[PDB]
Amino acid sequence: MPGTKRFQHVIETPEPGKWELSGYEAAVPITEKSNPLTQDLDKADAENIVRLLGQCDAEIFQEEGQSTYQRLYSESILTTMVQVAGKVQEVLKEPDGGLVVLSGGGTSGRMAFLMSVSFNQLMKGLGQKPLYTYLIAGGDRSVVASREGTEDSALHGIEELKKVAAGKKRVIVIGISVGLSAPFVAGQMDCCMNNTAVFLPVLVGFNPVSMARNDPIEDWSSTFRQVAERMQKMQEKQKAFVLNPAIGPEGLSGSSRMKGGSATKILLETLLLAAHKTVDQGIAASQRCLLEILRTFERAHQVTYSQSPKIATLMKSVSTSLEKKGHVYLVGWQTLGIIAIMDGVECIHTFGADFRDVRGFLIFTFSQEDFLTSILPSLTEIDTVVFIFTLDDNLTEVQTIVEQVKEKTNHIQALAHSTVGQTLPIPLKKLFPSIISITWPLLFFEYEGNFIQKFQRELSTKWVLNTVSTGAHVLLGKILQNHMLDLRISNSKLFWRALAMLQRFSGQSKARCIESLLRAIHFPQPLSDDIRAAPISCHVQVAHEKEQVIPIALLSLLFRCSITEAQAHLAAAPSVCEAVRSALA
Ligand SMILES: C[C@](O)(c1ccc(-c2ccc(S(=O)(=O)c3ccc(N)nc3)cc2)cc1)C(F)(F)F
Ligand SMILES: O=P(O)(O)OC[C@@H](O)[C@@H](O)[C@H](O)[C@@H](O)CO
Numbered sequence: 001m002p003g004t005k006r007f008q009h010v011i012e013t014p015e016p017g018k019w020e021l022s023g024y025e026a027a028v029p030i031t032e033k034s035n036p037l038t039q040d041l042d043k044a045d046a047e048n049i050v051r052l053l054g055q056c057d058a059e060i061f062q063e064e065g066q067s068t069y070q071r072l073y074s075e076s077i078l079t080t081m082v083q084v085a086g087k088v089q090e091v092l093k094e095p096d097g098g099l100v101v102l103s104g105g106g107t108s109g110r111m112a113f114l115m116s117v118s119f120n121q122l123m124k125g126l127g128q129k130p131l132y133t134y135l136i137a138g139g140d141r142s143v144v145a146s147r148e149g150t151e152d153s154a155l156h157g158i159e160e161l162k163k164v165a166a167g168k169k170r171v172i173v174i175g176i177s178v179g180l181s182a183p184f185v186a187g188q189m190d191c192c193m194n195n196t197a198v199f200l201p202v203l204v205g206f207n208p209v210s211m212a213r214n215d216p217i218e219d220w221s222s223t224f225r226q227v228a229e230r231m232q233k234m235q236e237k238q239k240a241f242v243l244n245p246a247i248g249p250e251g252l253s254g255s256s257r258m259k260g261g262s263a264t265k266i267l268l269e270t271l272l273l274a275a276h277k278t279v280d281q282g283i284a285a286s287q288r289c290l291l292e293i294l295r296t297f298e299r300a301h302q303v304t305y306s307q308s309p310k311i312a313t314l315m316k317s318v319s320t321s322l323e324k325k326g327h328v329y330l331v332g333w334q335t336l337g338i339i340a341i342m343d344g345v346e347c348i349h350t351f352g353a354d355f356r357d358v359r360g361f362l363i364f365t366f367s368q369e370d371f372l373t374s375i376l377p378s379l380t381e382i383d384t385v386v387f388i389f390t391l392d393d394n395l396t397e398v399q400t401i402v403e404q405v406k407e408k409t410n411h412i413q414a415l416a417h418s419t420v421g422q423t424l425p426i427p428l429k430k431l432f433p434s435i436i437s438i439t440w441p442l443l444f445f446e447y448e449g450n451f452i453q454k455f456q457r458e459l460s461t462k463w464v465l466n467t468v469s470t471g472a473h474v475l476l477g478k479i480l481q482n483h484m485l486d487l488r489i490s491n492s493k494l495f496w497r498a499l500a501m502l503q504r505f506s507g508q509s510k511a512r513c514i515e516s517l518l519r520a521i522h523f524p525q526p527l528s529d530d531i532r533a534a535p536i537s538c539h540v541q542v543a544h545e546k547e548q549v550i551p552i553a554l555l556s557l558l559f560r561c562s563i564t565e566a567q568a569h570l571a572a573a574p575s576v577c578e579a580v581r582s583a584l585a
Contacts, residue, residue: 003514003532009215010496012510013503029211030069031179031256032497033249038482041251041474046312046319049471052251053258054305057463059248060263061298069208069246072267072294077245078287081267084202084241085275085285088172091131092279097169100132101161102268104176105151105184107257109136110342111264112176113143114335114458118451119272125448126280135160137184144341144364146348146355148490149544152537154187154220161188165198172200174268177224178260180205180212180244181493186224187217189231193240202241203231204267206260209242215496218535243267251470253483254497257346258466262459266297269455277447296443296452297459303438304460310436311464314386314413318472321384321411322357328472329375330360331401332388335454336417336461337362340388343465351473352488358469368397372404379408387414387432388461391422402431415464417457436464477577480505480584486551486576489521489543492536498550505584506557513557520553521546523563551580558583 014022038052064074071077091098100119102112112134120130136142137157138150150156165171173192175185180203192201205212209232212225234240247263250256270293274285305311318328330340341360347353363371379385385405389398405412414432416424418439438460445452473479478486485505489495502513515527521543522531531538543549548570555566573579 001532002529006533006536007510007514010499010510010514013507013513016507027211028500029179029207029213030246030249031181031205031207031260032254032500034253034482035249035251038251041482042477042479044474046315046471046475047309049474050305050308050312050315050467053467053470054301054308054463056248056251057259057262057301057305060259060266061294061301062248070244072245072247072263074245077243078290080235080241080243081271081274081290082285082287083238084243085271085278085290087200087202087238087241088272088275089279089285091170091172092275094170095129095131097167098131099165099168099171101135101164101171101173102132102176103135103157103161103173103185103188104264105137105142105182106148107261107342107346108176108178108182108185108264109134109142111261111268112136112174114338115265115268115272117335118269118454119276121449122276122447122451133164135164135188137182144338144345146345148349148488148494149540151182151184151493152218152491152540154183154190154217156219157182157184157187158191161191169198170200171198172202174202174204176204176264176268178206178256178264179493180207180209180224180228183217183220183224183492186213186222186227187220189240190220190222190227193227193230193234196234196239200239200241201231202243203228204243204264206244206247206256206263208244208246213493215492215536218492218537251482252350252474252479255350255470255484257350258470262462262466265455265459265462266294269451270294270297273451273455293452296456299441300456300460301463303440304463307436307438307464310413310434311467312471314436314464315468315471315475317384317411317413318358318386318468319475321382322472323476324382326380326382326384327356327378328358328383329379329385330358330388330465331363331371331386332360332461333363333390333393333398335458336388336390337365339458339461340386340465343462343469347469347473349488349490350470351478351484352486353473358472363397363401368401371401376404376408379405381410383409384411384413385409387412388465389415390417390457391419391424395425399426399429399431406431415461417460419453480577480580485554485580486548489540489549491540495536495540495543498553501550502554502557505554508557513553516553516557517550519563520549520556520566523567548576551576554580555583 116132116134192199214225231240332340344360
C-alpha cells in the first residue's frame with residue numbers, strides 16, 4: 001500500500017514487556033540506543049549528571065568482554081589503525097600529488113576540520129607542504145553553523161570530494177560518520193571504491209557494519225550498509241578500511257556530538273600522529289606507538305573528571321542563567337575558542353536553543369577591543385561568562401576582558417590549562433575565586449608545536465563544555481528520561497529518531513506511530529496517498545519549519561485523539577514538558 005516501501009526497514013513496536021525478546025532492541029544501532037547508566041538522567045542533580053556523563057565517556061576506553069563487539073583496545077581495531085597509519089605514511093613519502101581528506105557531516109565535519117588544521121600545522125612546522133584538507137556537509141560555513149539538513153545528499157558529498165581531489169594522484173579519504181549513517185559520507189566512500197588507483201577510503205564510525213544504516217538514500221542507489229560491507233571485503237586486500245569500534249551508547253540518546261565526536265579525535269589523532277612521528281624515524285607504525293597515545297588520552301579523561309565538583313558548579317550557573325532567561329558566553333583563545341563556538345552552535349539543534357543562549361567566541365571571531373566594544377555592553381546580572389585558555393596564551397589580553405566583564409557580571413567561572421609548575425599571574429587573579437585548573441604532567445613530546453599537548457587540552461575542554469551544555473539543559477527539564485523528545489526534524493535520521501521515540505513512548509503500533517507523525521507534520525493537510533508515499537525529504541522539509549511536531553504527535557497517540565485536539569490540549573497546558581509528562585502518566 002502507499003508508503004509500505006518508504007517504511008519497510010522500520011521494525012514493529014514490540015508488545016508490553018517483550019522489548020527485549022522481540023529483538024527490536026537487538027537491531028537498534030548502538031549509537032541510537034538508550035544508555036542504561038542514564039535511565040534517570042532527567043532526575044539527576046548537577047553532581048550526579050557529571051558523574052553519569054564522565055562515566056559514559058569512560059566507556060570509550062572500556063575493553064572487550066569475552067561473544068560481543070570489538071572496541072578501541074581490541075586487536076582487530078588496533079591492527080587496522082596500524083595498517084592505516086601505514087598507508088598514510090606512503091602518501092607522506094610522496095607528497096607530490098598526494099592528499100589526505102577528513103570528511104563528515106555536523107560534528108563529524110567539525111572534528112574533521114580541527115584535525116586537518118593540526119596536521120597541517122605539524123607539516124608546516126616541519127617546512128613541508130600541507131597535505132590535509134577537510135570536507136563538511138554544506139561547505140565550510142557548516143563548520144561553525146547549525147545546518148543539520150545538509151548531510152542527506154550523496155551527490156553533494158561526491159561533488160565536494162571531486163572539487164578537492166582536483167588533479168591529485170594519491171588520495172586518502174577518511175569518511176567519518178559516527179552512526180555509519182550520513183549519506184554525504186556514503187557517496188564519497190562508494191566513489192573511492194570505483195577508482196582505487198587514486199583513492200583509498202577509510203570509514204570511521206561506532207557501530208558494527210551489521211548495524212550500519214540501511215534505508216534508501218534519496219539521490220543514491222546503495223545503502224550505507226552496502227557500502228560498508230563492500231569496504232570490509234576490500235580490507236582483506238588493503239584497498240579499503242573500516243575503523244569502527246563500539247564505544248557504547250550516548251548519555252543523551254543519539255547525541256553523537258558527545259562520545260562520538262570525542263572518540264573520533266581520540267582515534268584519528270592517535271593514528272595520524274603515530275604515522276607522522278614514525279616516518280621521520282624510518283620505523284613502521286606499531287601497536288605500541290598507538291597504545292602510548294591512547295593511554296595518554298585515557299589519562300586525559302581521568303585528569304579532566306578529577307575536577308568534577310567544579311564542573312557541576314559551572315553547570316548550576318549555566319542552568320540558572322538560562323532558567324531566568326539570560327545568555328551564556330564562552331570565551332576562548334586559539335583552538336579552544338573554536339571548540340567553544342562549536343559547542344554553543346550544537347546546542348541550537350540539540351536542545352532547540354537560541355544562538356544567544358550559549359554562544360562561543362574566539363580571540364564569532366571577535367578581537368580584544370572588538371569584543372569589549374560590541375558584546376560587552378549586552379551583559380547582565382544573571383548572565384554567565386566562561387573563560388577558556390592556557391597559561392601559554394597572552395594573559396594580558398585575558399585579564400583585561402575579564403576585568404571589564406566582572407563589573408557587568410559576577411557569574412564568571414573559568415577553565416585553565418597548565419603544565420605543572422606554571423602559575424597564575426596576579427595571586428589576586430582571584431578575579432576567579434575557585435577556577436577549574438587542569439594541570440598536565442610533563443610528557444616527552446618531540447614535534448615543534450607539541451601536538452599531543454594540544455589534543456589533550458582540546459579533548460578535555462570538549463568534555464567539559466559538552467557535559468556542562470548538555471547538563472544545563474537536562475536540569476531545565478527539557479529531556480525525557482535520556483531522550484530529547486522535542487527535537488526539530490531537519491534530516492532523515494532525525495525523522496527516524498522521532499518515529500522510534502513515538503513507538504517507545506506510546507507503545508502503539510508502527511502504523512499508528514507513522515500516521516500520527518505524518519499528520520502532525522503536515523497538518524492542516526490530511527493524509528493523502530501522495531504524502532504517505534512521499535520521499536522522507538518531503539516530510540523533513542515541512543517539519544523543519546514547525547514547533548512541537550513530536551510532542552503533538554505523541555499526545556495525539558496517547559489520547560487517541562486528532563491533531564486538532566492535541567494542539568488544543570498542548571496550548572491548554574502550562575508547558576510542553578508538563579503536557580507530555582502528565583500525558584505519559
Ligand atoms: C532508544 C529508542 O528506542 C530508539 C530506537 C531507535 C532509534 C533509531 C533507529 C534508527 C535510526 S536510523 O536513522 O534509521 C539509523 C541511523 C543509524 C544507523 N546506523 N542505522 C539506522 C534512527 C533512530 C532511536 C531511538 C527510543 F527509545 F529512543 F525510541
Ligand atoms: O557522525 P554522524 O552519525 O554521520 O552524525 C552526523 C551529524 O548528524 C551529527 O554529528 C549531528 O550533527 C550531531 O548534532 C549529533 O549530536
